[PDB]
Paper text:
All cytochromes c′ have a 4 α-helix bundle structure containing a heme centre with a solvent exposed proximal His ligand and a buried hydrophobic distal pocket with a non-coordinated residue (Leu or Phe, rarely Met or Tyr) in a position to exert steric influence on the binding of diatomic gases. Unusually, cytochromes c′ are able to utilize both heme faces (distal and proximal) as a means of discriminating NO from other diatomic gases. In order to understand the factors controlling distal versus proximal NO coordination, we have examined NO binding to AXCP variants in which the occluding distal residue Leu16 is replaced with residues that are smaller (Ala, Val), of comparable size (Ile) or larger (Phe).
TRIR data for the L16A variant have been described previously. Indeed, recent molecular dynamics simulations of geminate CO-rebinding in wt and L16A AXCP suggest that propionate conformation is a key determinant of distal AXCP-ligand affinity.
Numbering used by the authors:
A (entry chain A), B (entry chain A): 1 to 127
The structure:
């Protein structure tokens, strides 16, 4: 869907920005600093679910640029595993949110976070 | 969810970027220049549905900035109508995509487009 590689860069960075907001906005809830409303969280995690599937199609062949490390493309199987682990952890978060269980939510949230960070540590350029 | 107004600006502009991609990528299909795969379009419009609901919560009080015209806030009822008309047109697009009817899809797509443009013409600063 991208006319130039710059377009794929812009897309994935915007998807990431939205992921970051929908993930990170739950921090006060999982820490107990904001109230836990199960329905609010269930709806927000549904949004995060959708967003979570979006970036990966914008690292298509030839879309090198931004803060994407070239190893995304030369180590494609390894990058796919990081992405799939992340998306699997999103499924678990969806289950925790759907169950309405704050304990489970905080543990699932921590697993998602660690998956975001694992990928960045390997495949995102230092800033 | 935004620590500073700049954060809401960044969020809404990223949501818009994603909307633009998920909307605009269907142009070749509605024009007949790319093949129409009903399932592909149904799935893409589902993504657009989700995205389409996101920007409006990031024009909260005090989030003036970016290319948002101040009239968004001083004419709140009028801006809400533009947004609701847009979202209603997204519903119609969802129905057309769900029905698998290219005729209906192209007419619904044109209505959504016109709603995007109507809002921009009133509430987005010239660039
Ligand atoms: C690899 C499988 C990743 C996972 C999982 C996550 N992110 Fe990511 N992120 C990744 C890359 C390769 C990049 C760089 C993209 C580029 O071309 O520059 C990013 C970038 C971000 C950013 C910065 C985006 C920007 O606006 O420039 C953010 C804020 C970000 N990523 C957040 C984020 C979160 C919250 C994740 C888990 C919920 C997450 N990423 C997962 C690679 C991967
Ligand atoms: C009012 C109800 C709007 C509707 C409906 C749509 N858009 Fe929008 N858009 C709106 C505003 C007020 C702004 C400016 C936001 C800011 O703070 O700068 C925008 C911006 C865009 C942009 C540019 C985003 C950027 O990256 O800077 C795009 C590409 C855009 N809008 C696209 C778009 C599309 C495709 C829409 C219909 C599917 C659409 N917008 C609707 C206000 C409104
Ligand atoms: O909110 C975020 O969480 C991850 C990471 O910090 C979790 O450790 C990330 O990169 C964000 O923007
Ligand atoms: O793809 C887009 O469609 C609308 C508008 O051009 C429709 O007229 C818009 O602002 C986009 O980015």
């Amino acid at each position: 869907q991208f006319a130039k590689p710059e377009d794929a860069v812009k897309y994935r960075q915007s998807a990431a920005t939205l992921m970051a907001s929908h993930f990170g906005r739950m921090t006060p809830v999982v820490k107990g600093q904001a109230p836990y409303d199960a329905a609010q969280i269930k709806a927000n995690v549904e949004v995060l679910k959708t967003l979570s599937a979006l970036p990966w199609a914008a690292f298509g062949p030839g879309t090198e640029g931004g803060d994407a490390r070239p190893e995304i493309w030369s180590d494609a199987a390894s990058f796919k595993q990081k992405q799939q682990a992340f998306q699997d952890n999103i499924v678990k978060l969806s289950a925790a949110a759907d169950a309405g269980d704050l304990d489970k939510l905080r543990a699932a949230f921590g697993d998602v976070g660690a998956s975001c960070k694992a990928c960045h540590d390997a495949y995102r350029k230092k800033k």
